[PDB]
Structures are given as C-alpha cells and as structure tokens.
Amino acid sequence: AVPLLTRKIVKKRVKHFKRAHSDRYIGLKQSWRRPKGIDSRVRRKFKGCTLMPNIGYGSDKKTRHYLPNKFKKFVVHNVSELELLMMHNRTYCAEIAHNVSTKKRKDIVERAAQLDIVVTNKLARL
Amino acid sequence: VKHNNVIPNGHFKKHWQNYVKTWFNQPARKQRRRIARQKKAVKIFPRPTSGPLRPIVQCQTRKYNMKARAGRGFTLEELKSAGIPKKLAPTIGISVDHRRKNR
Amino acid sequence: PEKVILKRRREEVWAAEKKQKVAAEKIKAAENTKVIYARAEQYAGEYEAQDKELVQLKREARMKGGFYVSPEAKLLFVVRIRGINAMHPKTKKILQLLRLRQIFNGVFLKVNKATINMLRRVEPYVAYGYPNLKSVRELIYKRGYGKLNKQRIPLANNKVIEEGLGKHNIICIEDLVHEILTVGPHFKEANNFLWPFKLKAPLGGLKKKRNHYVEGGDAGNRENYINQLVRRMN
Amino acid sequence: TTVPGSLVWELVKKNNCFLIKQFGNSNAKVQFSKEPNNLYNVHSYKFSGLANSKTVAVQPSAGEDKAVVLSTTKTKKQNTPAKLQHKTLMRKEFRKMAKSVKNQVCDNYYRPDLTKPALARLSAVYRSLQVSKSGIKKKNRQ
Amino acid sequence: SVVKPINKEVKRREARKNPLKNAAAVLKLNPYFGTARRMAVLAEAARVKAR
Amino acid sequence: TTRFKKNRKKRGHVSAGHGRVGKHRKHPGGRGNAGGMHHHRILFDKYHPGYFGKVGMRYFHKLSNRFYTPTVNVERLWSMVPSDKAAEAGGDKAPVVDVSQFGYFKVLGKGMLPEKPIVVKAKLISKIAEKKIKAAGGAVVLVA
Amino acid sequence: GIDLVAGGRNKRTKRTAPKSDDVYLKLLVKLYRFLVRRTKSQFNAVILKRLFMSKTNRPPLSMRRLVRFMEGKEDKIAVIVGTITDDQRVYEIPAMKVAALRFTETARARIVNAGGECLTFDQLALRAPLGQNTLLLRGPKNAREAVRHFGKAPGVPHSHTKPYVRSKGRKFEKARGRRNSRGFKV
RNA sequence: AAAUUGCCGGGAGGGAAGCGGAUGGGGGCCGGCGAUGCGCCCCGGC
RNA sequence: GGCCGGUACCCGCGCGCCGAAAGGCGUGCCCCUCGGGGCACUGCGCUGCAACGCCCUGCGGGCUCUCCAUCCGACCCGUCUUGAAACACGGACCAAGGAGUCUGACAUGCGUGCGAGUCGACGGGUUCUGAAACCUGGGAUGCGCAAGGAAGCUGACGAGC
RNA sequence: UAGGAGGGCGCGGCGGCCGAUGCAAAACCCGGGGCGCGAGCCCGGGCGGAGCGGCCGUCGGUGCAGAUCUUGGUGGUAGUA
Numbered sequence A: 001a002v003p004l005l006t007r008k009i010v011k012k013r014v015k016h017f018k019r020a021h022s023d024r025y026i027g028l029k030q031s032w033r034r035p036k037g038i039d040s041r042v043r044r045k046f047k048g049c050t051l052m053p054n055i056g057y058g059s060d061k062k063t064r065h066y067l068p069n070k071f072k073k074f075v076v077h078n079v080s081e082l083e084l085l086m087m088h089n090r091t092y093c094a095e096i097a098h099n100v101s102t103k104k105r106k107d108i109v110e111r112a113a114q115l116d117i118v119v120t121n122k123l124a125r126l
Numbered sequence B: 001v002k003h004n005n006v007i008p009n010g011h012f013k014k015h016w017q018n019y020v021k022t023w024f025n026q027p028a029r030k031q032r033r034r035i036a037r038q039k040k041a042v043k044i045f046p047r048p049t050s051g052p053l054r055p056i057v058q059c060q061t062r063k064y065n066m067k068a069r070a071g072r073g074f075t076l077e078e079l080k081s082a083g084i085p086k087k088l089a090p091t092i093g094i095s096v097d098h099r100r101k102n103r
Numbered sequence C: 001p002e003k004v005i006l007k008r009r010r011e012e013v014w015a016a017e018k019k020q021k022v023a024a025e026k027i028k029a030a031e032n033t034k035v036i037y038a039r040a041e042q043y044a045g046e047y048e049a050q051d052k053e054l055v056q057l058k059r060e061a062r063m064k065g066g067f068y069v070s071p072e073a074k075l076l077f078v079v080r081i082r083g084i085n086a087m088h089p090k091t092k093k094i095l096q097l098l099r100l101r102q103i104f105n106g107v108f109l110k111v112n113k114a115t116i117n118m119l120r121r122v123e124p125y126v127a128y129g130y131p132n133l134k135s136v137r138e139l140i141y142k143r144g145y146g147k148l149n150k151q152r153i154p155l156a157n158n159k160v161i162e163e164g165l166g167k168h169n170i171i172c173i174e175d176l177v178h179e180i181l182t183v184g185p186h187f188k189e190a191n192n193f194l195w196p197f198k199l200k201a202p203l204g205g206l207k208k209k210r211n212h213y214v215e216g217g218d219a220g221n222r223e224n225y226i227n228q229l230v231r232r233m234n
Numbered sequence D: 001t002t003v004p005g006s007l008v009w010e011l012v013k014k015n016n017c018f019l020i021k022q023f024g025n026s027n028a029k030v031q032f033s034k035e036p037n038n039l040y041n042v043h044s045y046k047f048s049g050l051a052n053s054k055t056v057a058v059q060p061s062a063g064e065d066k067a068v069v070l071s072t073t074k075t076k077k078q079n080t081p082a083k084l085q086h087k088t089l090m091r092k093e094f095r096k097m098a099k100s101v102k103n104q105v106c107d108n109y110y111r112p113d114l115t116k117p118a119l120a121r122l123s124a125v126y127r128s129l130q131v132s133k134s135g136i137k138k139k140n141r142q
Numbered sequence E: 001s002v003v004k005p006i007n008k009e010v011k012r013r014e015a016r017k018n019p020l021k022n023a024a025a026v027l028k029l030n031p032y033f034g035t036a037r038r039m040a041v042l043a044e045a046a047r048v049k050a051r
Numbered sequence F: 001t002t003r004f005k006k007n008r009k010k011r012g013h014v015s016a017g018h019g020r021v022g023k024h025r026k027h028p029g030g031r032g033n034a035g036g037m038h039h040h041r042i043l044f045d046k047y048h049p050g051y052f053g054k055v056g057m058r059y060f061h062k063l064s065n066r067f068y069t070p071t072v073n074v075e076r077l078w079s080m081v082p083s084d085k086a087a088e089a090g091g092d093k094a095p096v097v098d099v100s101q102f103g104y105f106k107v108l109g110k111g112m113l114p115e116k117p118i119v120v121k122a123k124l125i126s127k128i129a130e131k132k133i134k135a136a137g138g139a140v141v142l143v144a
Numbered sequence G: 001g002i003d004l005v006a007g008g009r010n011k012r013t014k015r016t017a018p019k020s021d022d023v024y025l026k027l028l029v030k031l032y033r034f035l036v037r038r039t040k041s042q043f044n045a046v047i048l049k050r051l052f053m054s055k056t057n058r059p060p061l062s063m064r065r066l067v068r069f070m071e072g073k074e075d076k077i078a079v080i081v082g083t084i085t086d087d088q089r090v091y092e093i094p095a096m097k098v099a100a101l102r103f104t105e106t107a108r109a110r111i112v113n114a115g116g117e118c119l120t121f122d123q124l125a126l127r128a129p130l131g132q133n134t135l136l137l138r139g140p141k142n143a144r145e146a147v148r149h150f151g152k153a154p155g156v157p158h159s160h161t162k163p164y165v166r167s168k169g170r171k172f173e174k175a176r177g178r179r180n181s182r183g184f185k186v
Numbered sequence H: 001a002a003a004u005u006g007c008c009g010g011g012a013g014g015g016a017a018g019c020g021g022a023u024g025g026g027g028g029c030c031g032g033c034g035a036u037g038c039g040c041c042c043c044g045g046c
Numbered sequence I: 001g002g003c004c005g006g007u008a009c010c011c012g013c014g015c016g017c018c019g020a021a022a023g024g025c026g027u028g029c030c031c032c033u034c035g036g037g038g039c040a041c042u043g044c045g046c047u048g049c050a051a052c053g054c055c056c057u058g059c060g061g062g063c064u065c066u067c068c069a070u071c072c073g074a075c076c077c078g079u080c081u082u083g084a085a086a087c088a089c090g091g092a093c094c095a096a097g098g099a100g101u102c103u104g105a106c107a108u109g110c111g112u113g114c115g116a117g118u119c120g121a122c123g124g125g126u127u128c129u130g131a132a133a134c135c136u137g138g139g140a141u142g143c144g145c146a147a148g149g150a151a152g153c154u155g156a157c158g159a160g161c
Numbered sequence J: 001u002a003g004g005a006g007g008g009c010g011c012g013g014c015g016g017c018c019g020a021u022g023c024a025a026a027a028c029c030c031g032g033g034g035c036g037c038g039a040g041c042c043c044g045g046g047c048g049g050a051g052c053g054g055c056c057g058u059c060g061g062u063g064c065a066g067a068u069c070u071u072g073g074u075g076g077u078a079g080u081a
C-alpha cells in the first residue's frame, strides 16, 4: 500500500482544452473539436486565441495514468477481479465500479483490506 | 468518365427498381417442390418416381453432337419393332414422341 | 539436465573469451595512449615550429631587402548567418552542398578555385575566414560531433574515432585537429566525418547581416576575424 | 496443450475467457489475466497460464486457516484435465513453504523463470492469510 | 551451433564532460594536455623568478 | 463494412474530401461516356484506341456452336494417358489417345514431347503437331 | 528552421510485418527474426523480407521451371518463398529437396513419387539455418495477367499494353486507332 | 434535460460583454489531502 | 552568480596505516638536480550524494472547480474568394431529426482457399431450435489453359547476352 | 488549407466471453475528485425505481453549430405599438 512510483509527476498543462467558442453558445458542448475553418483564428493559431491540443503536450510515459495517489487505477466489479491485484498493490489501485451494490462494496473493501490493496472508494455508499 | 477503366455498359437507365426480382423465396420453392414430389409419389405409388421411360438420343449442334441425353419419347418405328402398340405405350410408362425420326 | 549443462558450457566459453578480449584490449589501450601522447607532442612541436618559422622568414626578408609574402591560407571556416527563408534555389543548393542547412552552422572548407568560387555565389548568406589553432581545436573539443553511421555521435571519447576513421591513420582528437588544420591528404574524410558545427548565437551581438564585412556588415571574407567571431559563437 | 505453447499463445493472445482488459485499446489499456494458475495475473507469454506446459499456481486454500496450495502442471499428463495439475496442500510456516516452493519450481529445473515471482506470490498469499486470521493491525503505508 | 555470441550489454549515451576544463576527461581526449601545461608553467617559473 | 469506409474519417472536414473550390456536383462531365468524340477525346484516344467505327463484315445470327474448336497442345497429351498404360508399352507399341473423348477437337503443337511414341486420334491436327508427333515416332489417326 | 525535405523523416514505406494474421506465418516471422538477428546471414535477411510479401509478390513457381533451376544442382536445397504448382508438361523430375510455403497437393505428390523430400521453412531452418548450400528462387512476378495492362498507355506509340476491353471481337476496339483504314494505326 | 423566468445567498460594474496566458484575493471541495512502521534485542507464553 | 541534474557504467568506495577531516604516507627508473616533477608494476570486488529544518485534522496543505481584480494578448464564427472583422452572405437561443448509402459492371491494392485449374451460384438428397448447415453433379456451365485475321482459315518446331 | 493514409475515441445491433442490478439499473443535475495531448473515460453525491455495462469478432439509417435546414419550445423587442 506504499506507492512504487519514484519519479515526480509533471504535467505540461492542467487546464482543459475547451472547444473554441464554447463560451458564447450553450449548444456547443465543452468537449474539444478541432476548428476546421478557413479563416479561423484558432486554426491559424494567432496569439491570444485558444490553444489546440498537440502531441507535444503529452506527459511522460513513466508517469502516465498515475493518479495523485501515485497508483494507476483499475476498476473492479467484484471480489473475483479484486483478488487479482495481489502483486500489483504497489502500482495499481482498485476502484469499485459505479454500479455495484453497497453490500458487495462492503465485501470488496473487506477483501481489499486483507489483501492490502489501495482503494479510492472505500468511503463510497455508506 | 475518368482514369483507365472499361467502357461502362450499365443497362440501368430504365426503371429497373420496379422489376428487381429477389430470390428470398428460393428455400421456399425448394421445400414446396419437395412437398409436391412426396404427394405425387404417394399418389402414383407404386409407379417409378422419375416418370415414364425416355430414349437415349444425341444432342444437336457440333458443340454437343457426341453427348447423349434423354430425349422426349420413343418413335413409332421403335415402338413397333419392340412390339408395343402406339396407344398402349404411354399407358404403361413409356413416352411416345411421334415427331422424332429414326435416321 | 543435458540441456542446461550444454547451455552452460558455451556460457563458460564465452565468459572466458570475453575476459581474454578485455585483457588484450587493456594492453591495446595502454600502448595506444602512449602512441597518442607521442603524436600530440609532435603535432604541438610543429605548431610552434611553424609559428616561429613564419616570423623567421618575414624578418629575414626584411633584413635581406625585400619582403616575404605569407602563404595564403589553405583552410576556411564558413558559418551561415541567414535563415532558410526566401532563398534563390541555386543558393539553396549551394548551401545544401556546403552542408550549411541551418542558420549558425559552421563548416571547414578546403581552399581551391572550385570551392571558393562556390562561396562567391553564396556570400550574402555566409560569413567566413581563416581559422587558427585555438579556434579549430576548441571547436573540435567543445562542439565536436561525428557522422558515425549517419548518426551524430558526440566526440566525448577517443574511441569514436577508432570507428569513424582508423583506415586513415587518425586515432585521436589531436590527430583529427592536426589533420584538418594543416590540410592533410585525408582532409576530405576527416571533414565529412565531422558533423556541421551547430553553433551558439553570437554573444555580444552581431553587426548588420545585410551588408558585407568590408562595407560594415558581416557576410563574406573576414579573413582573420572569424577567429574573433568564434570566441563569441562558441 | 496438444499443440505447442507458442501456437497456443498466438491463438489466445488477443481474446480468451480469463482476460480482463479495460480502458480501451489506446495507450491507457490495462490488461490482466484471471486464470487460477497465472501468478502475477499479467497477461504475457511468460506468465500466461494457458500457453504453457509448465505452470505454477500459488493460492490460498478453501475456507480453512493458513493452508496454501502450490500446484504445478504435469507436462506428460497434459491431455488429461482431471489429472492435469499436481496440487500440493501445505500448511507449515513460511520458511518451510519457501524451501518447498524452491524445491518444486527452481531446484528441479521445472521452471526457474518463475523462481522469484512464485515466491513473491507466496509471500503475498501467506500474509493475506495471516491478516485474515489476525486483523488489520498495521496500516502498511510507510 | 551457428549463432554469434549473445550480447546482453546495453551501452547508453555517456554524460558530457567539459572537454576544456575537466581534468579527468581532457586527459582521456588529449593525454599530452598535462605535459604541455606543465611545460608552459615551468617555463613561466623561470621567466618570473629571474627578475 | 461501413465502419471502415473512408467517409467516416472525413466526418467533420467540411468538404467530405471533395474539395472546396471545385465542388462535387451531379455530373459535371456528362452521364457515362458523354463526349467521347468531343471532350473526353483525350481519354478515349489515349486509353481505348480503336473504340469508334466499324471494322469487318456483319454475320447475321451467329451461333457460338458453329465456331467451337476446343484445342490442346501436344505438351499436355501424355498427361491424358494413365501411368499404367504408359508402362504397358514399349518402342513399337504405343498408346492411342482419343482427344474427342476428352473434349478436344483440334490438337495444336506447342511444347516438348517425350521420345516415347503416341498415337493421338483427333478430329483436327496442325502442321506442327504432326511434325512433332512423327519426329517423336508416333502417328496420327483422323476421326470424327 | 533547417533545410530538409519533410524534416528528414523517410518518406518511403516497406512491410515490417505481414498484413496476414496467420499464426503460423507469425511464428515463422519470429523464427527468422531470431535467425537474422543472431546469425547475420544475408540469406536469412532475404527470407525474412520475403515472408513480408503479398501474394502478388509471391507468385507460384511450377516444376517445369524448378527442374530447369535444379538441372545439375541436386546437392543444393531449393528454397521458394511462395507456392509450388505442378506442371503436367514435364515428365522426369529429379529427386529434389525444395522448401516452400505451400505445395499444391498434386505437386507435392509429384515430388514425393519422384523421391525428393518436400520441406517447409521450419524444416529448412533445421538443416540450413544460415542457408548452407541453398538455392533461393522467385517465381515470375511480371507474368501476372494484370501486368499485361501496365506501362505506358495503350494508345501511344510503341506501347504494347493490353487495353481493358469487355470482350474480344471485331467490334471491340479495332476500328479507329488500330488501323490505317479507319483513322490511324495507334 | 436545455433554452427561458422567478426567489434566496454571493460576486463585480466610467460608451460593451465573453475568450487565452500569469499568479493573487475570495470561496467550495479534497484525509489514498499526509506517516507513524521497520529492523535488533529480553521475557511470556503460543 | 543563474538554470538543470544527484548516479547499477564516467567518476566513487572497500580489500593497509595515520588522520574529525581536506587529505598524507611505499618501491623502482628519467628530469631538472634547490623545490620537487614525470613515468611505472595492477588485481579482485562493491557502487541510487548528503546535513538540518516547517507542518501533520490546523486560521493547515492545493485544487485542473467557481467568482473577482490586475498586466499582457485578443475583431465573429461558417463560407465563396488573390484577398473577410468587413459596410459580402447565413446565424436570436434551445432540444430532437439531418447529408457519399445500397445495387450492377470493371479495375488496382490487400487477405483467405485452392492452384492448370477454379468456382455447386440454377437444381437434387438430406436437415428433430433452423430460410441455417452438410452432401451431391462438371465428362468440359463461367472464367482460365492460344493467339492472329474482316473472313474463309491458320494456330506458337522449344533462347542467348 | 485542398487532399491522402495510419492509430484510436464514441452511438445501436448480432455471434461469443466476463460481469453488475430493489442493500438501487438506465437516464439526467452538480462550485465534487481525477485519467488521457484529444476524441473521451473512471469514480463521488442527488433525483430516479428497472434494467445495464465491459472485452473479441462483426454489422450499421453511427457522431452536428451552420444548409434564409425540418418539427417543437423559448427569449430580447415589451407591459412597448
């Protein structure tokens, strides 16, 4: 239950990449869509306009998908697939899936405490 | 038209979508013909199920002249020389083709 | 069983063979470093010998009544000073042939009528002149990279030269520096081995790059003063 | 495996009943294999419990205290599933469990590949049973 | 029986050492560096120590 | 497999992959082979030479049966005789092959023959088939 | 900014693994990866690069050409990374040892009844891993019917390319551009 | 469900507002947000 | 003095001593011959730099969420266009429906099966959930194995550099 | 940019495999916490009250901001004319 990651997590950008002109309209969702215009200041990348996602903003492969906990998450629906994280508890973190019952959650959390598996949802549904 | 391709021969300038014929009833005709064959066999029991007898004849046409096939019926000469009367031959399961000639 | 003992027999054989190669190569390096020591000693000795020889000759000529004309430089250092934008295609080809494919790259050039009339065609884009020993050696040390198997291998150890050269009797960094500076019978190979020096932007600034060095700018011959520029490109 | 191990792997490296894959097929993909006789449950040909003649399992037993089963597949009996695994129910303490596992995995050259991993899983299973017996006395976070 | 000897040896890029002011590395590139420096210093010694 | 059609990747690119300047209108060149002689002339007289015009004389009511000559090269004749009746043979005794029994009318003369004699019995022969069979020591029997 | 074409990244392409997800072919690929890596035999290099081929770059080779290629070289093992089809136009086939992907079931019987031994590439990798005394071959690539259509256009001078015609006959592209008496002679 | 309106609580406003990058000030929310466990030893029995 | 880095390799440590320690200490050969300097015999191993703090349920820490201020940037998108922020046209806002699909022929490319063959596609027999599946013919049905001529007709005699 | 290709994300079925669900499924709301460069995904809380998801293969009436787009609703104009 002690994290194995020995490298500080660095993120080249924490702010989201909101869609250009998601602000003026309500019908446009916040999710990113590349501006395809011919005269679009966003596509031409004038300074002062929203930034697009490049590949250059990518994060380190060895510090990728690590939660703030310093564990990679893995969603488990039941005790059967909880128990298969015995030899990954230093690097993988269980999350009980969002649609299980509270009864089964008690069982998974009880099982995970004795298998010593980090779980981020042990205070869920109670 | 554009890059090197055969000169098209699409014969779809009429209203062919009014005359498309689909074969989804193919299993249905198979099964219906099978049913009809059973109910003819039971009726013509105990006659042979292929029907009356058919002659060995040659095909026409240089392409198939050498290839023998079942014809339509025995000629009058053949029935006479085999000793079976004209009007009686179709009765007992023997076809008669008065139009063929024995050459 | 038989399978693993048979594996381990070869594992032992290879262990021993690797050890004996290391044993041979230690002696190889131990003698090779004395060979390098000798070569560098003699290269330095002839550096001072030539430097005193020039003064000796010039003084002797003044003494005997005439004057001595110095032997025109055999080597040029060319450094590109204009970017890859808005280039006449013939000029673009000239730079691609000289190996100046990015601003503030440096190349070493033979002097001859073939190449200097090639620079003639592209002077608005390069600044170039006559490197001396310090400039050449410290370019080779501090910014030395080798075109090794098309890869740019840093010249941080003597061993890279064993691979790039060694069919040319160049074994150390000091052989490479000598054989460039005193343009040698193998200068072509010992330059094509070098990767275009990717230099710093000129510390302290740069005069106007639009004009020629004679008129006040920076392109063209500055024969001795590439030396003065290199200490602030490098 | 009537067919060879490499062929079984090329047959089941992309889908099988024991493979739990989540987060899509992108760089985020997470892959485990949940067959009983895979130790790290990592879905690779080294650890795959289906593509191998020689596999070892280390499992806590049925409801009973501190009994560990170590099982190794019998290579020759391999087309006989009912008599396919040699299962070994041992209930002694940990040092004598580790000596016996080394005896059954590494020392007879059964499969030295999984010498260290089998013992690591044995440590994990043993202490899992130990805490199922005692309780959560240690937060195990430093 | 025919394969060449296995090569498990991984050679990474070596960290850079100052080739102009790192004594350990300049003596692997130019082993005469120390000798030239000593000659120059031991020549300065007399040129100052005389006067 | 609509999940593979490249239209799906062209979603979101305004022009669906047919250009902004020159758009994708109905039939900017004409239906079918329109303008073979006029503006597709370059195409028709570059890639389909000989397209336009009559050559040859008409043949009313052709039957393809009238023109039926299945042919076999000499090189393949010996495949027609089984190995057993290739063994039951010597220098003076050779197997007889009825190609018409195999569906061949003419026996053409392409390729090699083994030195072993053979009596091919066909309906039509070429000059060269006969020359090769005779030179191999066989003979020809014309039947129909 | 540096003056390079496409930033220097290689603009040509080649196969690095067969599009075919045939597990046996992938296993041969792994084997010959090992062989070309640890062995440094140019023969293994070529064999690998030719397993990374399509079926139009692996045309069949028949015995009437294989026997030509084996006439007087019975000591050396024939290798064809492709298919061996029989050829009823040859009569006596020397007992030969050929390694290939596939053997048409009649050609394999022909070879066996001739007394040679008929290999696959793993059996080849057994007794010629570096390729001792082997005779690599390729079938005729440009013999494919489609190739008769390629090259400079049918309607330009000196080109002998088959134009795509929906049927042969007098009416199908014989008239104008194929003779002097109607227009011109191509 | 959103568009849109009301009430309550907060925020800010010299002829626009909204958006990008900086932090800063407010909020609101996060205990896997952040640890107390390892080795050595002596009993006291397990 | 700035920024980055902190070690499985270059460095470094142990296998002797003195020394808190930086570090000093041996022998033999060359050089000056003062001061000392240079060179040398060389082996096993091991080999993630440290010191000290602050806080630890706090009025704490930090947040990619929200509001606000401030500096810098910043014309409204889609579009036809050489050129759009344009005094060019469409758009008040929201939700749902909404635009390269199906079929025929052909072709290249790729995959699979067979491979001088290959197709069972119209029919037939079977078919105990079945419009499925399986079997069957083909000795010539389609294409391919022969082409050149308008046609009568003829129809590849075996490759060297 | 026009264009081309590769790898993926997502919606709805079918053949399979692994599951969840009246101890609360689907949906939707949130100044809640995160992961991915991104399409998007995972978890928390509320309403909800009966179904649902993941992986492999495969299929499709499969992804909206525009078309004076279609249907339905709602605004400012306006308590004005």
Ligand SMILES: [Mg+2]
Residues within 6 Å of the ligand: A038, A039
């Ligand atoms: Mg534009």
Ligand SMILES: [Mg+2]
Residues within 6 Å of the ligand: B013, B014
């Ligand atoms: Mg019409």
Ligand SMILES: [Mg+2]
Residues within 6 Å of the ligand: none
């Ligand atoms: Mg300055």
Ligand SMILES: [Mg+2]
Residues within 6 Å of the ligand: C206, C207, C208
């Ligand atoms: Mg200036």
Ligand SMILES: [Mg+2]
Residues within 6 Å of the ligand: none
């Ligand atoms: Mg200018």
Ligand SMILES: [Mg+2]
Residues within 6 Å of the ligand: F013
């Ligand atoms: Mg585009």
Ligand SMILES: [Mg+2]
Residues within 6 Å of the ligand: F017, F018
């Ligand atoms: Mg297109």
Ligand SMILES: [Mg+2]
Residues within 6 Å of the ligand: F015, F019, F020, F023
């Ligand atoms: Mg358009």
Ligand SMILES: [Mg+2]
Residues within 6 Å of the ligand: F022
């Ligand atoms: Mg066009």
Ligand SMILES: [Mg+2]
Residues within 6 Å of the ligand: F021, F022
């Ligand atoms: Mg136009």
Ligand SMILES: [Mg+2]
Residues within 6 Å of the ligand: F038
């Ligand atoms: Mg005209």
Ligand SMILES: [Mg+2]
Residues within 6 Å of the ligand: G001, G002
């Ligand atoms: Mg760049």
Ligand SMILES: [Mg+2]
Residues within 6 Å of the ligand: G157, G184, G185, G186
């Ligand atoms: Mg002409």
Ligand SMILES: [Mg+2]
Residues within 6 Å of the ligand: none
């Ligand atoms: Mg609302």
Ligand SMILES: [Mg+2]
Residues within 6 Å of the ligand: none
């Ligand atoms: Mg006012």
Ligand SMILES: [Mg+2]
Residues within 6 Å of the ligand: none
């Ligand atoms: Mg702002």
